[PDB]
Amino acid sequence: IVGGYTCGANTVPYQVSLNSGYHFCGGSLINSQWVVSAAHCYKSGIQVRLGEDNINVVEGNEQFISASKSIVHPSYNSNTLNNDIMLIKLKSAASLNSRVASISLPTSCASAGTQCLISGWGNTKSSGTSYPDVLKCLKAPILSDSSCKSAYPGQITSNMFCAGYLEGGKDSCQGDSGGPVVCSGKLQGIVSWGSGCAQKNKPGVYTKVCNYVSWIKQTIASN
Ligand SMILES: [Ca+2]
């Protein structure tokens, strides 16, 4: 997260860290046994880390649970990043409390102008590299489809939306991939892609979760 603030320990209780020896992506806990992330975060051997703030220090509220199955969206296209969404089943149910909790799925899509919260452990600089150890947060609005398509001609599908600031300075960045975009208490987006981080006229692009609720629910109900 570039240009954000320190969330505060366990203030984003649905945020998870995907770990393969090191943090490599975020995700969101949608129930006691399932996490949703980006398909471009797929790899074998994932451990899901819940209840984290400092990812390099054991602080007492963590739960470390291995993944038992990963399901990449059937129509994911790695070249365009269309359908950039993945489900991860945990080997055992998480223990839900005030610091580890699930985030609701949306019943309706959020409209442009809605303010959302984006969070992650990604890079905090637009030029250079500095990775924080504690969770960072950014408040950002959903941008109009027109402004999003104008920023990225020929690249935005109906399964994507832009959020952030056209003037730059504030954005998600490398290492935030797969993490949540939460608006009015519902998961509306997944950190997907962009052109660099926090550059003028290049806002972040996010997977539009409201298009995938049926697939998510049917998949969880049969796996
Ligand atoms: Ca920790």
Structure tokens at 205: 């692009």
Residue type, 171: D
Whether 171 and 163 have beta carbons less than 8 Å apart is answered as: no
* Interatomic CA distance for residues 125 and 171, integer angstroms: 10
**Resolution in angstrom units:** 1.5
Burial of 167 (0-12, 13-18, 19+ CB in 10 A): exposed
Q: Which residues are catalytic?
A: 40, 84, 177
Region of 29 (left: φ > 0; alpha: ψ -120 to 50; beta: rest) is: beta
CA angle 198, 212, 117 (to 5 degrees): 35
- Distance CA(88)–CA(85), nearest Å, equals 10
State yes or no: 174 annotated in a binding site: yes
Q: 101 is written with which tokens?
A: 């909790």
Of 25, 1, 29, the closest CA to residue 15 belongs to: 29
Is 52 labeled as ligand-binding? yes
CB 197 within 8 A of CB 174: yes
> In this structure, how many other beta carbons lie within 10 angstroms of the beta carbon of residue 43?
10
How much distance in Å is there from the Cα of 166 to the middle of ligand 1? Answer: 34
Residue 175 CA to residue 124 CA, distance in Å, equals 10
CA of 95 to the centre of ligand 1 (A): 16
**Span from the CA of 121 to the centroid of ligand 1 (angstroms):** 12
Of 59, 187, 198, 64, which Cα lies nearest the Cα of 134?
A: 59
Q: How many CA within 13 A on the CB side of residue 25? A: 25
Q: Class for domain 13-102+211-222, per CATH?
A: mainly beta
160 touches 25 (CB < 8 A): no
CA distances from 150 to 54, 118, 136, 147 (A): 38, 23, 29, 5
Query: In the chain, which segments carry CATH 2.40.10.10?
Result: 13-102+211-222
Please state, in angstroms and rounded to a whole number, the distance separating the CA atoms of residues 175 and 144: 25
Asked if residue 212 lies in contact with residue 61, where contact means CB atoms within 8 angstroms, the answer is no
